[PDB]
Amino acid sequence: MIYSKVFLKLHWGFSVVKPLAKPGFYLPPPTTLIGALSYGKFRGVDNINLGNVYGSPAYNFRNIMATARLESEGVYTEDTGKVYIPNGRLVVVYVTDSISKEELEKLCWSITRIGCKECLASVENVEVGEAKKVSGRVKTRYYFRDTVKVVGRKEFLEYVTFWEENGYIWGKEGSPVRYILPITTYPLASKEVEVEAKEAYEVGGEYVVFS
Amino acid sequence: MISGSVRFLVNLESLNGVESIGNLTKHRTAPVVLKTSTGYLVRYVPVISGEALAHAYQASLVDIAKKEGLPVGSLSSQYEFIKFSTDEALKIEGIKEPKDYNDARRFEVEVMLKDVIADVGGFMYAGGAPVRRTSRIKLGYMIPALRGDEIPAQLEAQFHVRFSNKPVAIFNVEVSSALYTFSFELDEDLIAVPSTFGEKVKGEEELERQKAKRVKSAIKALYSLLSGNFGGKRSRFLPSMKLMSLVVTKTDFPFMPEPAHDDDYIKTTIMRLGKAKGVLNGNLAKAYVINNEGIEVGEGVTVLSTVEDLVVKLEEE
Amino acid sequence: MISGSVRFLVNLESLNGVESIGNLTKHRTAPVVLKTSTGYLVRYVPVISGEALAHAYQASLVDIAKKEGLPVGSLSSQYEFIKFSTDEALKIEGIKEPKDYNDARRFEVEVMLKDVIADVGGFMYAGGAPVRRTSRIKLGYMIPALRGDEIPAQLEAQFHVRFSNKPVAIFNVEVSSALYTFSFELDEDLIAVPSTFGEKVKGEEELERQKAKRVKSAIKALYSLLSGNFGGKRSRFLPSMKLMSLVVTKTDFPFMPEPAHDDDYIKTTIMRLGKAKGVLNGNLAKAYVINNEGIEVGEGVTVLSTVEDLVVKLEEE
DNA sequence: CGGGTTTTCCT
Numbered sequence: 001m002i003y004s005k006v007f008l009k010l011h012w013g014f015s016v017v018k019p020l021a022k023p024g025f026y027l028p029p030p031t032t033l034i035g036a037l038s039y040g041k042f043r044g045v046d047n048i049n050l051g052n053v054y055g056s057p058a059y060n061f062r063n064i065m066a067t068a069r070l071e072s073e074g075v076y077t078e079d080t081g082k083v084y085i086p087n088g089r090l091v092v093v094y095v096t097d098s099i100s101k102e103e104l105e106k107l108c109w110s111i112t113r114i115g116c117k118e119c120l121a122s123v124e125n126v127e128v129g130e131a132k133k134v135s136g137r138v139k140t141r142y143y144f145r146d147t148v149k150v151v152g153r154k155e156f157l158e159y160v161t162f163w164e165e166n167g168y169i170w171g172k173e174g175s176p177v178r179y180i181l182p183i184t185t186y187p188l189a190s191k192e193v194e195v196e197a198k199e200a201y202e203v204g205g206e207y208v209v210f211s
Numbered sequence: 212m213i214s215g216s217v218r219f220l221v222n223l224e225s226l227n228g229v230e231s232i233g234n235l236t237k238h239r240t241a242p243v244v245l246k247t248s249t250g251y252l253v254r255y256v257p258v259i260s261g262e263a264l265a266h267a268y269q270a271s272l273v274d275i276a277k278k279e280g281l282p283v284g285s286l287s288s289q290y291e292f293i294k295f296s297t298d299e300a301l302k303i304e305g306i307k308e309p310k311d312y313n314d315a316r317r318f319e320v321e322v323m324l325k326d327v328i329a330d331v332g333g334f335m336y337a338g339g340a341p342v343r344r345t346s347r348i349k350l351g352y353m354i355p356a357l358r359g360d361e362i363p364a365q366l367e368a369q370f371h372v373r374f375s376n377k378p379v380a381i382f383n384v385e386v387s388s389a390l391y392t393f394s395f396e397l398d399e400d401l402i403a404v405p406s407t408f409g410e411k412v413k414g415e416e417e418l419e420r421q422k423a424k425r426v427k428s429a430i431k432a433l434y435s436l437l438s439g440n441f442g443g444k445r446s447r448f449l450p451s452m453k454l455m456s457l458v459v460t461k462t463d464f465p466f467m468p469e470p471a472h473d474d475d476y477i478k479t480t481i482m483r484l485g486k487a488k489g490v491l492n493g494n495l496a497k498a499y500v501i502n503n504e505g506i507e508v509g510e511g512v513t514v515l516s517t518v519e520d521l522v523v524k525l526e527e528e
Numbered sequence: 529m530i531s532g533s534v535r536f537l538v539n540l541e542s543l544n545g546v547e548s549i550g551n552l553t554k555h556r557t558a559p560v561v562l563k564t565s566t567g568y569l570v571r572y573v574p575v576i577s578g579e580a581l582a583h584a585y586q587a588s589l590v591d592i593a594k595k596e597g598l599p600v601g602s603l604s605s606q607y608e609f610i611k612f613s614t615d616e617a618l619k620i621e622g623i624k625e626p627k628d629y630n631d632a633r634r635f636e637v638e639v640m641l642k643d644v645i646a647d648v649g650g651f652m653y654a655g656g657a658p659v660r661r662t663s664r665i666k667l668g669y670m671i672p673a674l675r676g677d678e679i680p681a682q683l684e685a686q687f688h689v690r691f692s693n694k695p696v697a698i699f700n701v702e703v704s705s706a707l708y709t710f711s712f713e714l715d716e717d718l719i720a721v722p723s724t725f726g727e728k729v730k731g732e733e734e735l736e737r738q739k740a741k742r743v744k745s746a747i748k749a750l751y752s753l754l755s756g757n758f759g760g761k762r763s764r765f766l767p768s769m770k771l772m773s774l775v776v777t778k779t780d781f782p783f784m785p786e787p788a789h790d791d792d793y794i795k796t797t798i799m800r801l802g803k804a805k806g807v808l809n810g811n812l813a814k815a816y817v818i819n820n821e822g823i824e825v826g827e828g829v830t831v832l833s834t835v836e837d838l839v840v841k842l843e844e845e
Numbered sequence: 846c847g848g849g850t851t852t853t854c855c856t
Contacts, residue, residue: 011394011470012352040465046343046406047315054312073251075242084241086354087472109490110465112396118261118351120394122467124483170341187244187251222560223575223669278809289725363568365559370546371579376608386669388561390568434807440782446650447578449668449711451787504563519803551856695853 001097003131003203006108007124008090013074014119015082019163019173024081026183027143028114029162031174033066033092034058040110055169062165067142067208068092074188083188090114090121093142093208095201101128131201138207139194146178148209152194156182212398213430213525216468216476217437218356218456218504219391225384226442226450227259238366238385243357256364257387259353264393264441266292268348269332271435275428276327281421284326294334295322309340316409318342323405324414331402331429344406347429349396350436355389356472364389386448390455392471397433402426430526437518457501459521460484461528464493478509499524530747530842532776533711533797534754535673535788541704541767543759544576555683555702558669564677574683574704576670576759581710583609584758585665586649589749593644596745598738601643611651612639626657633726635659640722641731648719648746661723664746666713672706674789681706703765707772709788714750716743747842754835774818776838777801778845781810794819795826816841 016025016032035058042048042057050059074085094104108126113119137151146159158181167174182193200207227239240255269292277283285304286293295301301308304325309318319342323330333346355364366387373380403422405415435441439452458468458477466487468480477500488496498512499521508514515521544556558575561568587607593600602621603610610617618625621642626635636659640647650663672681683704690697720739722732752758756769775785775794783804785797798815805813816830816838825831832838 009470012354043465044401044404044406045408046345048408054315073244073246075244075253077242079239079241082241084243086243087357087470106491109487112465112467113349117346117349120349120351120396120467122469122483123487187253220561220563222674223558223671359567361568363561363570365561365570367559369556369558369577371577373610374608375610376606386558388559388570390561431808434804435782438784440784446663446666447582447668449578449666449713451668451671451711451789453787453789517800517803519800519807522807523803548856553856689854690856692854697853698855700855 001095001131001133001201002101002104003093003095003129003201004101004104004108005127005203006092006094006111007126008092008111008114008121009124010085010088010090011120011122012086012118013082013084013088014115015080016115017081022080023078024076024083025160026076026083026158026181026188027070027160028068030066031163031165031167032114033068033094034061034064034165036111036114037061037064037066037094037107039112040107043110050169053169055172059165059168062168063096063098065095065210066092069141069143070183070188070190072189075186076188085188093203093206095131095203095208095210104128127204129203131203134200134202134207135198136200137194137196138200138209139192140200140207140209141182141190141192142206142208143179143181143183144195144197144209145211146180148180148195148197148211150193150195156184156191156193158183158185212396212400212463212465213459213461214394214396214467215457215459216394216471216480217392217454218471219353219393219439220453220455221391222388222451223386223448224388224450225386225444225448227263228385228444234381235368235383236385238387240366241354243362245357245360245362247360254362255366256355256362257366257389259391259442261350261352263443264350264353264436265332265346265348267441268350268432268436269328271440272331272428272432273328275431279424279428281327281424281428282325284328287326287328292328292332294329294332295326295336296334297337308338309336309342312340313409315340315342316405316407317412319344319405319407320412320414320418323403324417327425327428330425342407347398347401351393351395353391353393356392358472358474384448394468394470395436396467397429399426399430402429427526430522433525434518434522437521454501454518455504456506457499457518457521459499459525461495461497461499461525462488462493463495464488464491475507477512478507481509481512495528497528529779529781529783530714530716530776531712531779531783531785532774533785533788533793534709534771535773536670536708536710536756537770537772538708539705539768540765541706541759542701542761542765543767544580545760551698552685552700553702555704557683558671560671560674560679562674562677562679571679573672573679573681574706576708578667578669580760581667581670581753581758582649582663582665585667585749585753586645588752588757589648589745590645592745592748596741598644598741598745599642601645604643604645609645609649611643611646611649612653613651625655626653626659629657630726632657632659633722633724633729636661636722636724637729637731637735641734644742644745647742659724664715664719668710668712670708670710673709675791701765711785711787712753713784714746716746719743719746744843748839750842751835751839754838771818771835772821773823774835774838776816776842778812778814778816778842779805779810780812781805781808791823794829795824798826798829814845 038058038061047054048057072088163174197209228236241258245252333344336342403418403425469476650661653659720742786793
């Protein structure tokens with residue numbers, strides 16, 4: 001199981017509108033991160049024949065694990081929800097085993113935006129390595145699933161609804177999955193939360209929790 | 212590709228208004244958080260959206276294209292960028308709707324050949340068999356630089372009156388003056404290339420012939436944005452712009468420069484360009500810089516003086 | 529097009545006013561962002577609005593149009609430029625409101641054959657079928673030069689009394705002195721040309737006949753602005769004006785000369801004009817310069833002496 | 846060395 005870290009500098013912020021008044025999300029979903037990763041290889045094509053229906057040029061990277069977190073302060077504003085965090089930093093962690101280190105690093109250096117067109121984002125540095133799996137009590141900053149238990153004080157937890165990869169095909173709605181975010185609503189920032197969990201990869205001290 | 216970061220200085224300005232309240236027209240603002248020794252402060256700062264710039268760029272491209280004889284759509288000849296979105300739009304231009312998924316590529320080629328803006332700008336057709344085309348030009352919001360511990364932007368309300376001989380006549384307008392910065396991306400390599408898998412359909416040879424002219428026109432259209440012909444209320448509130456710092460990078464692989472929010476953002480982008488070329492096995496990497504506020508540049512960069520030189524050098528390569 | 533940048537020097541002036549407090553009449557002020565050797569700063573400076581300049585220009589145009597035999601609207605004959613916005617103006621003038629979208633062109637041509645002011649300065653009608661016409665002359669706020677670290681402007685208050693034999697009579701007035709700058713744009717290729725898309729409508733032949741006279745009058749109307757007949761409180765606070773520098777450029781393509789903020793803004797705009805004509809595939813580019821402060825100009829530039837010569841040269845070409 | 850500005854208005 002290999003892992004990679006990437007540091008992104010944002011220009012003005014990101015904007016992803018909730019499916020189904022147009023409120024937005026607080027942090028990008030894993031689908032957006034996987035698509036941003038896949039952009040490095042599938043650049044220039046917008047419709048590929050999956051075999052039965054044209055749904056997206058991204059239904060092939062669906063088995064890559066990804067998380068992300070903030071490192072600065074920003075504000076969520078509706079005026080079409082947006083998250084303004086100019087000149088901020090975003091740290092993204094990719095954990096997978098499908099491709100070798102070289103391919104993942106090459107695709108990691110090839111990220112241009114997160115969400116819509118305006119949300120450009122530069123790349124400052126990357127790291128590649130091998131991760132280890134543990135199950136003891138850990139402290140994390142990246143968001144995780146709803147089913148994961150919690151030992152600390154419930155003070156900085158929020159609930160959001162994300163979708164699986166099934167939504168990659170047009171004319172179809174993805175399955176709803178609950179997620180827990182360790183975020184302060186105003187102003188936006190990230191806080192550490194201690195969890196027990198069952199699977200957690202050590203990617204440099206900042207343990208990442210998946211289940 | 213072509214990537215750019217640009218820094219602007221604007222005075223006594225109102226280009227992007229928003230919903231009117233009472234008898235007042237308001238400017239567009241966004242909240243930012245500023246760090247102080249005591250703590251944090253929330254400040255509202257004027258901005259300019261990313262849609263006005265796209266509209267100005269598309270209008271300039273239309274004006275340039277109609278001079279060289281390239282095809283232009285009927286509804287896009289008028290400055291009405293609805294594009295071939297619904298059936299009513301297709302009826303005026305005279306294009307049959309796509310039959311099924313397998314015939315999508317033919318429809319895309321037909322649209323791409325009947326209108327340049329639908330190619331460079333991109334279009335979306337809703338219906339039973341939707342067709343997509345992402346824009347070849349990416350533009351972001353114009354936000355003043357959050358540099359240091361002070362935000363160099365203000366916003367005031369001005370009072371105006373219309374004179375009449377039989378009183379029975381008052382309005383207010385918000386004006387601003389900031390130090391703006393924005394960055395953009397363009398991919399001239401994907402111009403005049405269809406964006407759907409399948410087999411080649413008759414008519415692609417015309418696109419191959421027109422590729423060079425379309426690329427030249429798309430590059431030429433950047434002069435309008437880099438010269439400052441965007442926004443509104445220019446009849447009575449014509450602004451006063453000026454160029455301070457500009458970095459443009461031309462490569463053969465994905466890359467973008469640092470945001471122009473720090474006082475030293477050219478050295479960082481040059482170093483990162485070197486590293487990215489080293490890691491991604493690129494071949495072409497050139498940087499052009501225009502400097503007017505006297506900040507540190509670095510080494511290994513051609514120094515220009517104006518924007519026309521930049522456009523000439525971009526076209527040559 | 530005709531694009532210009534002008535620099536004026538005004539002393540002991542009160543031309544634009546705002547709401548009053550107590551017995552004090554205030555001068556319009558606005559914030560500016562200025563670059564100094566220590567960074568960027570924000571200042572509050574007196575300004576003169578652009579709508580006053582537009583009013584002066586349109587009044588001079590009314591005078592010239594009446595003198596030369598061109599038609600002038602009933603309401604605009606008296607210096608009240610409500611134009612054709614509300615229904616009362618339509619009832620007074622005697623023009624039927626548009627019925628549907630297809631009738632918009634008829635309404636525009638009918639309004640455009642009765643008042644030259646509506647043709648040149650544009651107009652707006654709001655209703656079931658709104659009609660818009662953008663102004664053909666573009667102006668902006670009058671700002672003092674942002675040169676160096678010190679803004680060359682000053683504002684103060686003055687004391688005045690009214691005499692009476694039976695006391696029972698004191699007021700204050702703000703007075704300014706500064707070095708103002710402003711720029712303008714006038715596209716004479718669209719004068720006497722309908723803007724709303726549609727079919728041909730009877731009455732365009734008369735417009736084609738009168739186009740030359742309308743263009744001549746529009747160009748002649750700039751003499752008032754270039755001379756200094758604008759602003760209020762001229763009965764007791766007549767200002768002392770003096771031209772210092774002027775650059776006027778005639779082109780066939782969009783172009784904008786540099787703002788008159790730096791001491792070297794004539795050489796730069798000429799170099800940019802040459803390169804822009806080279807790059808945009810233009811066919812005409814002429815420049816005229818009036819210089820009275822001994823700053824750098826360049827080579828191969830027509831040099832005039834007064835403003836009347838400039839107006840005559842613009843008319844002849 | 847004595848002497849150091851007096852009113853009537855303030856939209």
